[PDB]
């Protein structure tokens, strides 16, 4: 066959269902109908205690657990991706995997609108030109056609420059560390002469 490439490669057995769920929802152009139908089901477990009894209670028979789920999802225009997923997770008793699929469905979705989050920490609050010169620095730290959003915080422990935090890497072009990276270079070099 031929499925779309998932943007991220993820972990296993709950992140592995979510990347299969993303791939059949990218083939059907249902990447946001399936996503909010997950988000409805997250809310459906909070309100109905007998719906979450179909995911935690081990003494629910599997013939009950797949017939409550199918006869409840037969209408209301749910995606055929969704009501096939939910009878599959109810066949195996994996309905409690659903908080963990929804989290990994988000990370595949947010890497599909290449929107990457950010946090910029500066010394004092920015100008409108200090904002514009900074994204020109910062979209050279995302390696594709990605867009950075931003989040602006302040710290006068920095002496100007900035710290960009991407939640999996940071880049420190602040001059408070440029001082320390200068000092330790000349504290190493006078000991080499």
């Amino acid at each position: 066959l031929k499925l779309p490439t998932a943007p991220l490669q993820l972990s296993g057995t709950s992140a592995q269902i979510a990347t299969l769920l993303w791939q059949v929802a990218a083939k059907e152009n249902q990447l946001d109908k399936v996503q909010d139908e997950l988000y409805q089901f997250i809310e459906l477990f909070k309100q109905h205690s007998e719906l979450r009894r179909l995911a935690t209670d081990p003494f629910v028979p599997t013939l009950v657990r797949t017939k409550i789920i199918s006869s409840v999802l037969k209408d209301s225009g749910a995606s055929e991706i969704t009501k096939k997923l939910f009878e599959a997770l109810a066949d195996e008793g994996a309905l409690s995997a659903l908080l963990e699929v929804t989290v990994n469905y988000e990370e595949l979705m947010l890497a599909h609108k290449k929107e990457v989050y950010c946090t910029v920490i500066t010394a004092e609050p920015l100008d409108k030109l200090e904002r514009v010169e900074l994204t020109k620095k910062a979209e050279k730290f995302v390696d594709a056609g990605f867009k950075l959003v931003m989040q602006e915080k302040i710290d006068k422990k920095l002496l100007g420059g900035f710290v960009i935090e991407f939640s999996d890497r940071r880049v420190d072009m602040s001059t408070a560390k440029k001082v320390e990276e200068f000092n330790n270079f000349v504290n190493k070099l006078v000991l080499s002469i």
Binding site: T13, S14, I42, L85, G93, A94, L99
Partner: peptide
């Protein structure tokens, strides 16, 4: 928190995706 029962899943099958892929793929047009 009332959703905290579902935060940690454990499965009865190591090959759970091989059953899930046999029901999600024929949901495609």
């Amino acid at each position: 928190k009332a959703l905290d029962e579902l935060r940690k899943p454990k499965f009865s099958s190591k090959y759970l995706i091989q059953h899930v892929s046999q029901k999600l793929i024929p949901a495609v047009k």
